[PDB]
Amino acid sequence: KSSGRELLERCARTAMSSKLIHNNADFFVKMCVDAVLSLDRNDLDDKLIG
Amino acid sequence: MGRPFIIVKDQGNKKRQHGLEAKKSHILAARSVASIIKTSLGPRGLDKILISPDGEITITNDGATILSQMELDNEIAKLLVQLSKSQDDEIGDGTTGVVVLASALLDQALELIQKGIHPIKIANGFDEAAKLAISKLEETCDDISASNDELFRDFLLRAAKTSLGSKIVSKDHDRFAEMAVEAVINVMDKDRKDVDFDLIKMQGRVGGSISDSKLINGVILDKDFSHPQMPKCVLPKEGSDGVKLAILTCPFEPPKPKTKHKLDISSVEEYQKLQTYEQDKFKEMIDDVKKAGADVVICQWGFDDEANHLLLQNDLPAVRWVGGQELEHIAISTNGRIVPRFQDLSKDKLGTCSRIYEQEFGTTKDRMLIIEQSKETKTVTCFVRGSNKMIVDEAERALHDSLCVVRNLVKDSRVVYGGGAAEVTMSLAVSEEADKQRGIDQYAFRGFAQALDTIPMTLAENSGLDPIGTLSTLKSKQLKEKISNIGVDCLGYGSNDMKELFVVDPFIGKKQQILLATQLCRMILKIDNVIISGK
């Protein structure tokens, strides 16, 4: 019974590894996590996040 | 398995670079680029000649233009070309110091790679050390926004005279600093101020001397008047000092539809009726201007031979073959609106100009339009002269970089003292935190602190001073005394204080120097396999 917002934050920081974001992941992870929440849970699109 | 071995197409032109010698080749290559512009840093810096394949030559010391329009091969130095372009676009100043600092981070990291430290572990310490340097300079950064507009005007002069000392414009810093500052003041809002660089225009002219360059508020057009015999100067009569300038995108031409049309005429009767038709159009076009009281009319397409003299008898000057972009910039300074059609012409859309005269240059044949405003207007225009075509173009980039420093103080009033004072202040902050934490990151912190010391040692080397005696003197006054105003003096004054020398640099400009250099070298250390295809 944990929070749904903190679930997507820990999973997003894993993909930030091996990239240039690993050091800057503090500010950058807080972006993409809020990007998927704007989209509808039923329909997720990769063209809108362009 | 036979003799032919093929996986990736074109294996002959594609070469693979790997190993410890790979890091040694790309780091030492980036140093040669900064070594060229190393002598170009500071007021003692020297220019560089750039030759284009078409034969046009350009002489500039700005690292943004030097790296631009230049043929390169290695991809590491091509990243430095985009590095100086990144510093030039947003900030507009400091393109030389970023490339030198970027190569200093690689030279200090080259010795750390051979010690057995992973390249990313070297770059991870640079990101943590860059945040401590910014937080230290921000604490000592003075805020000039607490003063009024009287003291703020002199604050912009300190920032302009510093950037103009490294160019050919450095001959007179006092006279040419007012042109950059006063041009910005006109577009400032006095509250929540934005520079809006779009309103500022720069038009150069090749001839005369640079001392004849003066700031004129208005629009500069190189298009001559439609008829030669109209008077050169235009002045208002009695009251209403405005000349009622009219800007019409539609010239004087026989009305025709844009689509393809065919007009069928029957014998003599309809042939004679259309004769009077067009003859009444010229009388209709001239009555609209006289009804609204307009004087000068400008348009995209040239007037007809019958329309040229029609405006002369009514004492109505006109200019033809004006570009579409030039039409929009005129209506802003005149507080007017461009008239789309002859039926929409009204006195509310007419412009206002204090004086307009017809400029002539020497023995060459040209006519330059000069619009002047007796009161503060919305736009400004830079007028630059020079004894050489390249000096004019160099004075353009010199004045452009000066306008980029002034606009940085408009958004952020926080400024720092440059000239070796800011680099040493941020360098000693990292060295103090390296001995406290110790660990395996103490070598990455010392390499970042010694890399920041390359900038003040470069300013002292080009000025003839001893880098050993200069660097040791700065660290003594910075550690003992909390005043960070002590910095490198390239001109050789008896005092090393940067505050008494009126040297002020924007904080957003010096902050991006470490940010752009640290983020670039982190990717360079992450490059192992290098595949270069021959062209």
UniProtKB/Swiss-Prot annotation, chain A:
Localization per record: Cytoplasm
Summary of subunit composition and partner proteins: Heterooligomeric complex of about 850 to 900 kDa that forms two stacked rings, 12 to 16 nm in diameter.
Role summary: Molecular chaperone; assists the folding of proteins upon ATP hydrolysis. Known to play a role, in vitro, in the folding of actin and tubulin. In yeast may play a role in mitotic spindle formation.
Family as reported in the entry's similarity comment: Belongs to the TCP-1 chaperonin family.
Protein name: T-complex protein 1 subunit eta
Gene: CCT7
Curated annotation (Swiss-Prot), chain B:
Name listed for the protein in its UniProt record: T-complex protein 1 subunit epsilon
Compartments where found: Cytoplasm
Annotated keywords: ATP-binding, Chaperone, Cytoplasm, Nucleotide-binding
Function per UniProt: Molecular chaperone; assists the folding of proteins upon ATP hydrolysis. Known to play a role, in vitro, in the folding of actin and tubulin. In yeast may play a role in mitotic spindle formation.
Gene Ontology CC, one term: chaperonin-containing T-complex
Organism: Saccharomyces cerevisiae (strain ATCC 204508 / S288c)
SUPFAM superfamilies: GroEL apical domain-like, GroEL equatorial domain-like, GroEL-intermediate domain like
NCBIfam families: chap_CCT_epsi, thermosome_alpha, thermosome_beta
Similarity annotation: Belongs to the TCP-1 chaperonin family.
Gene Ontology molecular function, alphabetical: ATP binding; ATP hydrolysis activity; ATP-dependent protein folding chaperone; unfolded protein binding
PROSITE patterns for the chain: TCP1_1, TCP1_3
Subunit structure: Heterooligomeric complex of about 850 to 900 kDa that forms two stacked rings, 12 to 16 nm in diameter.
